From a paper:
Here we identify and characterise a sub-family of multi-centre photoreceptors, termed photocobilins, that use [name] and biliverdin (BV) to sense light across the visible spectrum. We have identified and characterised two types of photocobilins, one from Saccharothrix syringae (SasPcob) that represents a standalone photocobilin photoreceptor and a more complex protein that consists of a photocobilin diguanylate cyclase (DGC) fusion from [name] (AbDPcob) that is representative of a photocobilin domain fused to an enzyme domain. Crystal structures reveal close juxtaposition of the [name] and BV chromophores, an arrangement that facilitates optical coupling. Light-triggered conversion of the [name] affects quaternary structure, in turn leading to light-activation of associated enzyme domains.
Despite the low sequence identity (~34%), the structures of the two photocobilin proteins are similar, with an RMSD value of 1.63 Å for 464 C-alphas after structural alignment. Both the SasPcob and AbPcob proteins contain the W-(10)x-EH and E/DxH motifs in the [name]-binding domain, which is found in other light dependent CarH-like [name] photoreceptors. The D ring is positioned out of the ABC plane by approximately 40° due to close interactions with Trp296. Although the putative BV binding globin scaffold is retained in AbPcob, the reduced BV affinity is most likely due to replacement of a key BV binding residue, Asp270 in SasPcob, with a His. The crystal structure of AbPcob revealed that steric hindrance by this His residue interferes with BV binding, unlike in SasPcob. Molecular dynamics simulations and ligand docking demonstrate that rearrangement of surrounding residues could allow BV to bind with AbPcob in certain conformations, where hydrophobic interactions with residues in the binding pocket (e.g., Leu252, Trp289, Leu294, Arg297, Val299 and Val303) contribute to retain BV in the correct orientation. The lack of the main binding interaction with the Asp residue in AbPcob may explain the absence of any obvious spectral shift and increase in absorbance at 700 nm upon BV binding that is observed for SasPcob. These findings could explain the lower BV occupancy levels for AbPcob whilst retaining the ability to respond to red light. Unfortunately, we were unable to obtain crystals of the full length AbDPcob protein or the light state of AbPcob. The weaker binding and lower occupancy levels (~20%) of BV in AbDPcob suggest that evolutionary pressures may have reduced the requirement for BV and resulted in a different role for the globin-like domain in these more complex fusion proteins.
Numbering used by the authors:
A (entry chain B): 2 to 246, 249 to 252, 254 to 331
B (entry chain A): 2 to 246, 249 to 251, 254 to 332
Write the structure that this text describes.
């Protein structure tokens, strides 16, 4: 009867898109007086993480996950239909980072907030920066919460924080890209960071009660790190052109997968540099290496790919040299 | 009253993210014995299109639409929780086209089918080709329904049809990209085409009962049209490099223009692929009026198209006449 112990039966149904028994479990816990926050964190988010890990281990496909993610959204919808109305005044706007389509991160977070009596509008997946600030303005938002699932979205989170400051609004950030403490968040000028709803509820309720001062001076970022971000396309696509004159010829699917991986590589590298945390790049190499290992595609390809990136990457950002000379 | 007459009050709530009253309308109609299909088509789909048009007229932002789209998803979820189990055997797999993220087209369609007693798995937004086919295989899907909201996704729908054929599975297609008849669909090798669920229900129920022959011959397509598809990024990004030596732009504007030019080459390529000029002509009309309501001078796009000319015809000389048609 702990939410955690229901992950397996939930997944059994969720992975094949069998919504009804899986949302029934969700609602049975709720009716047995389990706090919603726990249901969301310990069952739904935990299940979704396991889906992601199975995909990652090449034990599931995107088709399975798509179904699992729909069931998760249906569970959140069911839960939301049980909620009493907001007890707190002051609208919190929850947004995925621009470029980020993990709507469910924003939605799970925002729903946990709702369950603490917050008035919450979840934009979910990627919205233009200027459209988010304009929404804050029109909807009289107290606070912006930005949910970021990969560190490759950081440049835009920084820009978004800046735009929000220009209109007086404070930004809390979170989700897995920001790690287990506030160092990455602080490096981008976020007014706050938290790991989950419990803490964010304190910060947000505090921003409602006492609307804090916000810089309006943009947080300093390494320009070379940003130029390396901007160039990720060019470097990847140009790396893949050479290589296929012809040191590995690769079908149209394989060339696109490689190209896509190398764009990601340069973006993790740029992100590591931007917020001065080497582990972002090192964790990516570990991550991708094992992604490919379960998929029986020789890693001479990616090695060759990284090899190719070397000369052009350092031409843009020489400070990335040292990051590359571990791998 | 009729579902159609509730569009305006539905939107009033949906566009500001006020889920509960808007989902309640959908459930009130259902309690008043209104068929689900009608609710979905006449209220939900109708509202979502009007959201689209307000966005298009620059009267709404993507932030407001994201709210409206969440409400629509929650409405479908509520309605789905009222359905009895399937009365029909034989699994229909509903997928957005690869590259297409309009999950709600697939979901609205699939849900109308469910309401006719079909067993349905909605993959929704973009899934890799080989993951869709592997799902069909593992789940023993009778039929694939592909939902396509832009004609720039056609090459991959063709590939997908081909993969489905290799495993003996028939494909119906639909969604707004396929127009008012079956000509575009047929040109890509689809085994059938329909406007909505009512017709597709007849075709699908017929495929369950009498399992049809499927061509293990790929539908013929012009390679130059495909090479022009493949090159869209290169041509756009390279067109925008020239033009900014310097005929006129901030980092936002350069990216918007670049993105519009990738679209231009893809609508052009799509028009060529299925031999329907109107795909490209409709796009020019569409984009021209998109920008007009946004007060961004159309000298820029003109100049952009102008720039594409030399490279585009170098790849596909058969596009020349389509380009000179315009201005
Ligand atoms: C489903 C899923 C997707 C779905 C999302 C669908 C949807 N509607 O959301 C789709 C299909 C879009 C997808 C696409 C991709 N994703 Co994905 N996928 C996931 C999965 C399984 C997450 C789904 C989810 O439900 N998240 C919601 C829950 C589980 O998140 P949470 O972190 O528990 O949220 C809590 C806390 O973070 C906190 N919190 C969250 N936000 C905020 C905000 C604030 C302010 C605060 C205080 C707190 C807070 O509170 C929440 C309380 O519940 C994960 C697995 C994972 N996250 O471990 C990946 C994962 C994030 N995806 C991944 C990848 C790689 C991809 C793709 C690049 C794959 C590809 N296409 O080739 C794309 C990128 C798309 C993009 N640009 O955003 C990787 C990232 C790996 C890495 N960084 O090295 C992951 C980790 C999977 C993996 N490898 O294990 N993905
Ligand atoms: C909401 C929305 C989005 C959302 C969708 C979120 C979601 N689905 O969860 C998001 C934000 C993802 C989005 C993004 C974009 N979209 Co959009 N947006 C829409 C909108 C408003 C979709 C509304 C929706 O709910 N669709 C479901 C309903 C309304 O669809 P329906 O067509 O009635 O479906 C029925 C029939 O077609 C049929 N049917 C449907 N599928 C199938 C399949 C089969 C097999 C059969 C037999 C029948 C069938 O039965 C259905 C049920 O009755 C439309 C507006 C519109 N459709 O006119 C655009 C629209 C499709 N989007 C558009 C654009 C431009 C974009 C973006 C390019 C914006 C951008 N990046 O700049 C991107 C493209 C993303 C991509 N696909 O890769 C344009 C396309 C323009 C064009 N020239 O083709 C539209 C038309 C808006 C407009 N009026 O300009 N979009
Ligand atoms: C992180 C999640 O993204 C999904 N995923 C991985 N690659 C793609 C893709 N090309 N398109 C759509 N979804 C994808 C998987 O289901 C994984 O679990
Ligand atoms: C076609 C639909 O897509 C949304 N839309 C338009 N541009 C973007 C973008 N850059 N990011 C996300 N959504 C967008 C609008 O809400 C519109 O209605």
């Amino acid at each position: 009867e702990a939410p955690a112990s229901y992950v397996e039966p939930y997944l059994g149904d969720a992975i094949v898109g069998n919504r009804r028994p899986a949302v029934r479990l969700t609602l049975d816990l709720l009716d047995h007086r389990v706090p919603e926050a726990d249901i969301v964190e310990d069952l739904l988010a935990a299940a979704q993480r396991e889906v992601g890990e199975r995909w990652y281990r090449n034990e599931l496909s995107p088709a399975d996950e798509h179904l699992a993610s729909g069931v998760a959204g249906a569970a959140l919808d069911a839960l939301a239909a049980e909620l009493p109305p907001p007890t707190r005044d002051g609208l919190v706007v929850v947004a995925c980072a621009e470029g980020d389509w993990h709507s469910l991160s924003a939605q799970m977070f925002g729903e946990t907030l709702r369950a603490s009596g917050f008035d919450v509008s979840v934009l979910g997946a990627s919205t233009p920066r200027t459209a988010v600030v304009d929404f804050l303005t029109r909807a009289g938002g107290d606070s912006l919460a930005v949910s970021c699932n990969m560190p490759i979205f950081f440049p835009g989170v920084a820009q978004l924080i800046n735009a929000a400051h220009e209109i007086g609004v404070p930004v809390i950030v979170g989700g897995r890209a920001f790690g287990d403490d506030d160092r990455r968040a602080a490096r981008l000028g976020a007014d706050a960071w938290a790991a989950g709803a419990s803490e964010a509820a304190e910060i947000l309720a505090g921003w409602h009660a006492r609307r804090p001062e916000v810089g309006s001076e943009p947080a300093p970022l390494d320009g070379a790190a940003l130029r390396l971000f901007a160039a990720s396309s060019t470097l990847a696509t140009a790396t893949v052109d050479e290589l296929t004159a012809s040191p590995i010829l690769l079908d149209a699917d394989q060339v696109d997968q490689l190209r896509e991986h190398l764009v990601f590589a340069v973006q993790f590298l740029a992100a590591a540099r931007l917020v001065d945390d080497d582990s972002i790049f090192e964790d990516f190499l570990v991550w991708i290496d094992e992604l490919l290992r379960t998929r029986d595609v020789p890693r001479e390809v990616l090695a060759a790919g990284l090899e190719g990136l070397r000369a052009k990457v350092i031409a843009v950002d020489p400070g990335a040299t040292r990051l590359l000379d571990a791998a």
